[PDB]
Amino acid sequence: RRAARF
């Protein structure tokens, strides 16, 4: 969800 694979 953040910026990279999340």
- Structural determination approach: NMR
Terminal CA-to-CA distance of the chain, rounded, Å? 4
Q: Residue 6: how many CA atoms within 13 Å on its side-chain side?
A: 2
Question: Cα–Cα distance between 5 and 3 in angstroms, integer?
Answer: 7
How many CA atoms does the CB half-sphere of 4 hold within 13 Å? 0
